[PDB]
Amino acid sequence: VFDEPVYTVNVLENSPINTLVIDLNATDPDEGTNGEVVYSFINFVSNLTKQMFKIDPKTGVITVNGVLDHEELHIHEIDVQAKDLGPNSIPAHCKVIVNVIDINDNAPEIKLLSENSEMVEVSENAPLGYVIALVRVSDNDSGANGKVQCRLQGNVPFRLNEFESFSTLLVDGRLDREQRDMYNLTILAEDSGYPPLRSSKSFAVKVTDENDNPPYFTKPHYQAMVLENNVPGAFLLAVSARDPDLGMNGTVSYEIIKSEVRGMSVESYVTVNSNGEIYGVRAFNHEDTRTFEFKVSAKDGGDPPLTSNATVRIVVLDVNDNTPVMTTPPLVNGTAEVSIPKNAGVGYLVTQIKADDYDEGENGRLTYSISEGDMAYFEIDQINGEVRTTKTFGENAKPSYQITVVAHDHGQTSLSASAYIVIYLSP
C-alpha cells in the first residue's frame, strides 16, 4: 500500500527529459508481504498526460518523458498502481498530480489589422484621430509573464489608444504628401516577467495622394510683343503650370477661354499647345488691333478636377506697312487742275494738299514737298500742305504750270504717294 493516497507536485514548464518528478514507494512489505512490487500508470484524466511522464516499473520513480507546456496543459492527474504479482492480494493505487508551473518562455506578439497586410496607409491631411490600423499585442503566458504594455517611438504624427481588447493607431498631426510621402514607425513592446521579455516591430506608413493642389502658373499675367504682319502659325509665347500632386491629379492640360476679340473669337486670333505654347493663328494688324488680352486655363485629372487660369496681353507693334494716301485735292488719275488770277500777288494760296497714313508714330508722320515741276513759281508747307505763289506773273508768262507734290512718311524705309497739280492762270 502507498504511503499517501494522493500526491501533489510542482514541475517546471519545459523541464528536461528524465527529470525526477517523485520517488514513490508502495510501502514495500512492512513486516513482510509477498513482495516483488510493480509500478504502472493505469489512467490519466487527459490522454496528453500519457506522453509526458514515465515510471520505472520496479523502483517506482516517475520522470519526465515529454515537453511540459503550461500553455498546452498545466495540470496532470495520474492514476498509478503497485502490484505483488497477485499471489493472494489486491493492488494498491494512489493518485499523482503534477502542477506545471508557468515560466516566461513566450515574449510579446505585435500584430497589425489593416487591409493591405503590412502596408499601412492614410490619405494626406486625414483627420486627427483617424484610425489607420488596429494593433494587437499578446503574450501567451500567464500572470506577470502574460502582462504587456507597448509604446510608439520617436516623434512622428501618430499615437496609440490602449483598450481592454486591443490598441488603436491613429493620426495625431497634419499630413502633407508634397512634404512627406512616408513614415517609418517602430512599436516597442515588452512583457512584465523578470526580466521582462521585449518585442519590437518596425513598419511603413504610406501617405496616399489627394488632389489638394492645382497647377500653379509661373505668372498670373503673361505678356508678349509681336510684329504686325506675322505669319499664321508663328510661335508667340509659352506659358507653364505645374501641379505637385501624383499622376492624373498632377498632370496639366491647357485651354484658352472663349472670348471675342474685335467681334469674333480668341481661337481666330490665338491658339494654345497642350505644352503651354501660344501660336498666332492669324496675321495680326496694328491698324485693327494694337492690343488684345485673354485668359488661359490649366486643369488636372482628379474627381473632380481643379483649375488655375492666367491672363495674356499681346502687344501688336507698328510696322510701316501703309503707304500714305492722297485725299485732297480730289484726284483724277492722280492729278488736279486749279485756276488762279494772273495778277495774283505773292503768297496767294493756290491749293492745299493733304494725305492720311494709318500707321502710328514716325511711321505715320507726313511731310509735304514739291518733287519736280515748276518748283520755282510755287512753294509748299512741310506740315500744312498749303501751296502758295512765290513769284508774280506778267507780260508773256506761260499760262500753265505743272507741279508734283508728294507726301512721304518717316518709317525705317519711308513710304510715299505723289500728286500732279496743274495751275492755270485765269485773267
Instruction: Please say which residue, 60 or 214, places its beta carbon nearer to Na ion.
Output: 60
20-59: contacts with Ca ion (CB under 5 A):
none
Instruction: Please say which residue, 80 or 353, places its beta carbon nearer to Ca ion.
Output: 353
Contact (CB, 8 A) for 280 and 234: yes
Choose the stretch contacting Ca ion; rule: CB under 5 A; options: 216-224, 314-322, 344-352, 388-396: 314-322
Cell of 192: 512584465
Beta 120-123 vs 198-208: how paired, if at all? parallel
Which of 19, 22, 69, 77 binds Ca ion (CB under 5 A)? It is 69
Which of 109, 176, 374, 386 binds Ca ion (CB under 5 A)? It is 176
We find the least distance from the C-beta atom of residue 190 to Na ion, in angstroms, to be 44
Q: Which does 322 bind (CB under 5 to 8 A by kind): Na ion, Ca ion, none?
A: Ca ion
Using DSSP, state whether 250 is helix, strand or coil.
helix
Instruction: Give the integer Cα–Cα distance in Å for 178 and 61.
Output: 74
Distances (CA, A) of 141 to 106, 109, 147, 209: 6, 11, 8, 43
Choose the stretch contacting Na ion; rule: CB under 5 A; options: 25-33, 113-121, 136-144, 259-267: 25-33
Which of 357, 378, 403, 405 binds Ca ion (CB under 5 A)? It is 357
Instruction: Give the integer Cα–Cα distance in Å for 250 and 294.
Output: 24
We find the least distance from the C-beta atom of residue 58 to Na ion, in angstroms, to be 9
Q: Which does 249 bind (CB under 5 to 8 A by kind): Ca ion, Na ion, none?
A: Ca ion
We find the least distance from the C-beta atom of residue 145 to Na ion, in angstroms, to be 34
Does 27 interact with Na ion (rule: CB under 5 A)? no
Long-range contacts, stretch 366-371, CB < 8 angstroms, 24+ apart: 366/324, 366/407, 366/408, 366/409, 367/407, 367/408, 367/409, 367/410, 368/405, 368/406, 368/407, 369/405, 369/406, 369/407, 369/408, 370/403, 370/404, 370/405, 370/406, 371/404, 371/405, 371/406, 371/418
Q: Which does 25 bind (CB under 5 to 8 A by kind): Na ion, Ca ion, none?
A: Na ion
Instruction: Please say which residue, 23 or 362, places its beta carbon nearer to Na ion.
Output: 23
Q: Which does 23 bind (CB under 5 to 8 A by kind): Na ion, Ca ion, none?
A: Na ion
389 φ, ψ to 5°? Answer: -80, 140
Contact (CB, 8 A) for 415 and 409: yes
Residues 6+ apart with CB under 8 A from 167: 134, 135, 136, 137, 150, 160, 161
Contact (CB, 8 A) for 222 and 238: no
Instruction: Please say which residue, 250 or 329, places its beta carbon nearer to Ca ion.
Output: 250
What DSSP designation does 108 have?
A: -
Q: Which does 49 bind (CB under 5 to 8 A by kind): Na ion, Ca ion, none?
A: none
Does 60 interact with Na ion (rule: CB under 5 A)? yes
Q: Which does 359 bind (CB under 5 to 8 A by kind): Na ion, Ca ion, none?
A: Ca ion
Would you tell me which residues interact with Na ion (CB under 5 A)? 23, 25, 59-60
Would you tell me which residues interact with Ca ion (CB under 5 A)? 69-71, 102, 104-106, 124, 139, 141, 145, 176-178, 191, 209-212, 243, 245, 249, 285-287, 300, 318, 320-322, 357, 359, 363, 409
